[PDB]
Paper text:
Periplasmic adaptor proteins are essential components of bacterial tripartite multidrug efflux pumps. BesA shows the archetypal linear, flexible, multi-domain architecture evident among proteobacteria and retains the lipoyl, β-barrel and membrane-proximal domains that interact with the periplasmic domains of the inner membrane transporter. However, it lacks the α-hairpin domain shown to establish extensive coiled-coil interactions with the periplasmic entrance helices of the outer membrane-anchored TolC exit duct. The adaptor multidomain structure is conserved throughout proteobacteria, but primary sequence comparison in the spirochete Borrelia burgdorferi suggested that a tripartite MDR pump, BesABC, included an adaptor that appeared to lack an α-hairpin.
The crystal structure of the complete BesA protein was solved by SAD in three space groups, P212121 (2.35 Å resolution), P21 (2.5 Å) and C2 (2.6 Å), in which either a monomer (C2) or four intertwined head-to-tail monomers (P21 and P212121) are present in the asymmetric unit. Given the protein is membrane localised by an N-terminal lipidation, this head-to-tail arrangement, also seen in the isolated CusB structure, cannot be physiologically relevant. The BesA monomer shows the archetypal, multidomain adaptor topology, with the MP, β-barrel, and lipoyl domains in linear arrangement (coloured orange, yellow and green, respectively). However, the expected final α-hairpin domain is completely absent, confirming what was predicted from sequence analysis, leaving only a nine residue loop (Pro106 to Leu114, blue in Fig. 1B) linking the two halves of the lipoyl domain. Density for this loop is visible only in the C2 monomer where it is stabilised by the loop of a neighbouring monomer in the crystal lattice, but high B-factors here and poorly defined density for the P212121 or P21 monomers indicate the small loop is highly flexible. In both the data-based assembly model of AcrAB-TolC and the in vitro co-crystal structure of an adaptor-transporter (CusBA) subcomplex tripartite pump assembly is facilitated by the flexibility of the adaptor’s serially-linked domains, which was confirmed by MD analysis of the closely related MexA. This ‘hinge’ flexibility at the inter-domain linkers is also evident in the BesA variant space groups which show movement of the lipoyl domain, relative to the other domains.
Author numbering: 45 to 105, 114 to 317
Write the structure that this text describes.
Amino acid sequence: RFPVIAMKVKKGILSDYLSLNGDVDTKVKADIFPDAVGKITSLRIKLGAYVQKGQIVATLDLKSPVRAPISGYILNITKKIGETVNPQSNIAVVGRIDTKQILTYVSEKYISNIKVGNDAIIEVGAYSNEKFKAKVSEISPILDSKSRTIEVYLTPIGSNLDKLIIGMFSKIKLITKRFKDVIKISREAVVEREGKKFVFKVDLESKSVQMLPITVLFEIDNIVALSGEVEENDLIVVEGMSALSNGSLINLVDTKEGLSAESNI
C-alpha cells in the first residue's frame, strides 16, 4: 500500500494576468509658475498643504506674488527660497486627491483584448494592505512607435485608497482571462504518462486509486485548472502520485482542504 495525501477538490476561479508597471497620478493637476522674473523671498506652502485657486503660495522680488492656479494639495515643491525664477520656472505642483489615476504603458500586441471596465490589482507592496482594486478607464488612441506602447489608464476603486498616494510607483496586475467553475488543484497532482496527463482519484471503500485523464486549461503559481472526469469533492492525490498506476493500492495518510473557490487574483 503506497502512501498518498489527497485533496478534497473544489470548483473555482483561476485568473490570468498581464504584469505591468505604472504610477499613481491624478487627472486634475497643474504647475505653479510665477507671473514675473526674480528671486524667491518666501514660500508659504509645504508638501500636503491645501491651497485655493488664487492663493498666494510664494513671494518674489518690490515684492511680487506667486498664486495657485487651481484649488488642491501641494504634491511637489521644486524650488528653494533664494533661487531666481521666471514665468516658465516650475515652483510646485498642485493636484486633486479625489481624481486619482494609475498610468501604465502596454505593448501593442496586448492591446486588442484590453477593454474599459477590465479589472486590475494595483500593488505597492506584498501585503493585502498594500494592494488595491482598479478598473481600466481609458485606452489612449496613441501608439508611441519607438516604445511600441499604448498608454492605459486605470481608476482605483474600493476601500482605503488613502494609502494609494499620488507619485507612487506601483506594480499592476491587469486581469486578462478568468477560468470560472473549474476544478483547481496543486500542479504536482498532474502526472505525464505516454504524452498525456492524468490525476489519481482515491476510492475510499476499496482504498485504491483510479488514473483519470485530464486537460489542463490554465496554470499559474503552481495551480492547475483542469477539465475531465473530476468532480467537486473527489479525493485527488497531491502527494505520492509519481509512484502510482491505475488500480494502485494506497494508504490515505491525510486529506487536505480544497484550494479556495475564489480567484487567485
